Amino acid sequence: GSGFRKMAFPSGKVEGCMVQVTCGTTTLNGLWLDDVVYCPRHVICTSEDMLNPNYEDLLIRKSNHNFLVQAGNVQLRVIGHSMQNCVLKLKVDTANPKTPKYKFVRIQPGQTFSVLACYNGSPSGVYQCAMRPNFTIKGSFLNGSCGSVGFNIDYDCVSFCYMHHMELPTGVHAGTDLEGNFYGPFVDRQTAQAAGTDTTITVNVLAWLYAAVINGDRWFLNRFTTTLNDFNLVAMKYNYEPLTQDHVDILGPLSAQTGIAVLDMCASLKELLQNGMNGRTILGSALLEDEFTPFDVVRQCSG
Amino acid sequence: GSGFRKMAFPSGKVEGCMVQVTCGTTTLNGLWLDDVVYCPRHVICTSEDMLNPNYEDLLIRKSNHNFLVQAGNVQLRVIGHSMQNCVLKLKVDTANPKTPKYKFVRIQPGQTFSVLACYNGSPSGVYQCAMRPNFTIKGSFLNGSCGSVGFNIDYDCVSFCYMHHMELPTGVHAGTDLEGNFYGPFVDRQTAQAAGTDTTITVNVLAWLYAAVINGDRWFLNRFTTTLNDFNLVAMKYNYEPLTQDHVDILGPLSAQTGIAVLDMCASLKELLQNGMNGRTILGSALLEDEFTPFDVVRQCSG
Ligand SMILES: *[C@](=O)([C]([C][C]1[C][C][N]C1=O)[N]C(=S)[C]1[C]2[C]([C]N1C(=O)[C]([N]C(=O)C(F)(F)F)C([C])([C])[C])C2([C])[C])C1=NC2=C([C]=[C][C]=C2F)S1
Numbered sequence: 285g286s287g288f289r290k291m292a293f294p295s296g297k298v299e300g301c302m303v304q305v306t307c308g309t310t311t312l313n314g315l316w317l318d319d320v321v322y323c324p325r326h327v328i329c330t331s332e333d334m335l336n337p338n339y340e341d342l343l344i345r346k347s348n349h350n351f352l353v354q355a356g357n358v359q360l361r362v363i364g365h366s367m368q369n370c371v372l373k374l375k376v377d378t379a380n381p382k383t384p385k386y387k388f389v390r391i392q393p394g395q396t397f398s399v400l401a402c403y404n405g406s407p408s409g410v411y412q413c414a415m416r417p418n419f420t421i422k423g424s425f426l427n428g429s430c431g432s433v434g435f436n437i438d439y440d441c442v443s444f445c446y447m448h449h450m451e452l453p454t455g456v457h458a459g460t461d462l463e464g465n466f467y468g469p470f471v472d473r474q475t476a477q478a479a480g481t482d483t484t485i486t487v488n489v490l491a492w493l494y495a496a497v498i499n500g501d502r503w504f505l506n507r508f509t510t511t512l513n514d515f516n517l518v519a520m521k522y523n524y525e526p527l528t529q530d531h532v533d534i535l536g537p538l539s540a541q542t543g544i545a546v547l548d549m550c551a552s553l554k555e556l557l558q559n560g561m562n563g564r565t566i567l568g569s570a571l572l573e574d575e576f577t578p579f580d581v582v583r584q585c586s587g
Numbered sequence: 588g589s590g591f592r593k594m595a596f597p598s599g600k601v602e603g604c605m606v607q608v609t610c611g612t613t614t615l616n617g618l619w620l621d622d623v624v625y626c627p628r629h630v631i632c633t634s635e636d637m638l639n640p641n642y643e644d645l646l647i648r649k650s651n652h653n654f655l656v657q658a659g660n661v662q663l664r665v666i667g668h669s670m671q672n673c674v675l676k677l678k679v680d681t682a683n684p685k686t687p688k689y690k691f692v693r694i695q696p697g698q699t700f701s702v703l704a705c706y707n708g709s710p711s712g713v714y715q716c717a718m719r720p721n722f723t724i725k726g727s728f729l730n731g732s733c734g735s736v737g738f739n740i741d742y743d744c745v746s747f748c749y750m751h752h753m754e755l756p757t758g759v760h761a762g763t764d765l766e767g768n769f770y771g772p773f774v775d776r777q778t779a780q781a782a783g784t785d786t787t788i789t790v791n792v793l794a795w796l797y798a799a800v801i802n803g804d805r806w807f808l809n810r811f812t813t814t815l816n817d818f819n820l821v822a823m824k825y826n827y828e829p830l831t832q833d834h835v836d837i838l839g840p841l842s843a844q845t846g847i848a849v850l851d852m853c854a855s856l857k858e859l860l861q862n863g864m865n866g867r868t869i870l871g872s873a874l875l876e877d878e879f880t881p882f883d884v885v886r887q888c889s890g
């Protein structure tokens with residue numbers, strides 16, 4: 285069949301929006317759209333401030349001219365500045381000529397997006413991620429990655445959904461929407477902070493099992509069926525999110541392509557949860573994958 | 588630490604080179620660099636021809652004007668055509684204004700590259716791949732993906748190494764360099780064709796174990812050491828490629844960063860091969876990964 289990979293959106297349209305933002309000695313990435321530059325507000329922090337910053341007091345000591353915005357090897361002139369939640373917005377004199385059509389969106393737990401990991405305003409790599417149920421992501425991010433953004437592409441329109449801010453003690457990642465509001469309960473200070481218990485995104489697992497069937501990987505299809513409540517009792521036990529009839533409906537395309545009822549596919553999933561995989565693999569994986577949505581599977585398997 | 592993901596190069600520079608190529612009713616992707624368009628030569632085939640095509644006889648019945656090259660919603664004029672091995676080269680009247688600095692390279696088994704999967708000359712997604720020892724790739728590719736290219740980025744320079752041509756009966760993929768020479772023993776006809784036995788890329792597995800240590804995942808570090816020959820006897824048995832002193836030397840960076848000798852890391856790998864992973868995971872994987880090179884691990888873990 286198609287084969288199967290974690291695929292990212294083409295990053296060109298976003299590459300044209302990345303810039304370097306410096307304030308004193310701190311440098312990080314910003315996003316230049318029309319005549320506004322968006323970056324994390326803790327660009328105005330030193331190493332000292334980050335333990336418990338008073339962002340309003342810190343920002344008061346800053347002027348337009350304390351902010352050094354550079355695009356390639358070319359400076360921009362900052363003519364205004366405002367803090368919106370955990371984001372700084374810098375008004376510059378020049379509209380980005382490379383600006384794409386774009387929206388800002390706040391995504392839901394379980395949805396996926398592409399990340400363009402950047403350093404010093406320069407793009408380094410692109411990868412695909414999911415917003416975990418506990419509003420963390422499992423990214424790859426070094427010092428200086430802050431202000432890197434996540435996004436989806438509709439057709440000609442880029443929907444920006446994420447800006448990178450921090451790594452939590454567990455080694456997973458947290459950040460904001462493009463209005464500066466954190467996903468999850470996190471704040472932008474250097475303090476011990478815990479995410480909750482994470483859960484598996486059941487509907488995504490089901491989508492990936494449909495992708496497996498479509499590619500010819502069918503060993504795990506068992507001989508039973510189940511009920512929503514029956515499945516959901518089992519899901520509880522294994523830390524899977526509960527499946528609803530919304531989820532059933534969203535899987536309708538894959539269900540109809542394959543001729544396999546959602547509840548039958550749920551029956552096969554139960555048995556995998558209770559019996560394990562016993563050394564076999566599925567689409568070359570020894571674990572159950574939950575970071576492809578139903579939409580993702582449809583794009584890559586059907587086109 | 589960083590975290591760890593299959594990361595692709597940013598695709599923008601390549602997005603600017605993709606075009607649609609049509610001959611009669613067949614359409615596929617081409618690459619527009621300066622005033623040449625490169626595509627697979629079987630663009631000139633119908634469904635009938637593909638069983639056993641005589642490419643020279645087929646191409647003889649074609650003129651410049653039988654070739655419809657379209658970039659966005661804009662036609663180009665074809666003023667010359669030549670077959671180079673399994674590639675068609677079309678001379679057009681217009682130099683690509685978006686052409687990047689570029690080379691054509693023929694990569695070695697075990698090396699990685701990014702693929703920009705395209706349909707109708709339009710980019711759909713980007714993912715990272717390895718050239719298997721038997722010169723196949725495990726891609727994700729639908730009808731119409733042919734002429735999609737693989738590449739690496741040096742700094743400002745794109746090194747094109749792969750053009751997509753076919754899916755083999757096992758559901759893996761084969762194709763050419765940008766001069767039209769197949770990787771592996773494949774030919775461009777619809778016939779049963781077998782790749783050899785594939786093998787694990789041992790040096791890549793070792794690189795990934797170093798990445799694990801760097802991220803704090805250290806459970807598998809055992810208490811022994813080994814010799815190259817000792818390791819290589821064990822490798823033979825499990826279908827791993829033999830490790831050489833070249834490979835030892837290439838791992839020197841990761842070895843020196845971590846303070847763990849290659850041969851000690853080999854000792855840990857042997858035990859994993861003989862004892863298995865026993866339900867544990869490494870960088871969230873239940874299998875041993877062989878599609879990150881030493882260079883790849885250094886970029887993502889050190890930067
Ligand atoms: C960013 O680029 C980094 C990105 C971070 C570096 C390591 N992996 C990453 O994703 N973000 C940092 S330095 C943030 C900022 C302070 C502390 N912090 C952390 O990520 C921090 N995490 C926590 O304290 C947490 F609450 F437990 F999550 C550590 C311990 C992992 C360092 C902020 C304000 C939360 C940025 N770099 C700088 C920024 C501002 C000023 C100077 C920088 F160098 S933002």
Ligand SMILES: *[C@](=O)([C]([C][C]1[C][C][N]C1=O)[N]C(=S)[C]1[C]2[C]([C]N1C(=O)[C]([N]C(=O)C(F)(F)F)C([C])([C])[C])C2([C])[C])C1=NC2=C([C]=[C][C]=C2F)S1
Nearest residue numbers: 629728730731732733752753754755756775776777778780
């Ligand atoms: C391409 O876009 C496809 C890509 C292919 C479609 C399914 N997965 C893919 O990667 N390539 C095709 S149609 C090639 C071409 C003929 C047969 N073939 C195959 O990939 C073929 N494989 C074999 O016969 C093999 F030898 F076993 F590997 C199948 C059975 C998988 C179909 C070529 C010349 C080898 C292209 N599409 C067209 C092309 C040319 C003309 C018309 C097309 F529609 S190239």
Ligand SMILES: [Zn+2]
Nearest residue numbers: 488574575576
């Ligand atoms: Zn999934």
Ligand SMILES: [Zn+2]
Nearest residue numbers: 791877878879
């Ligand atoms: Zn590897």
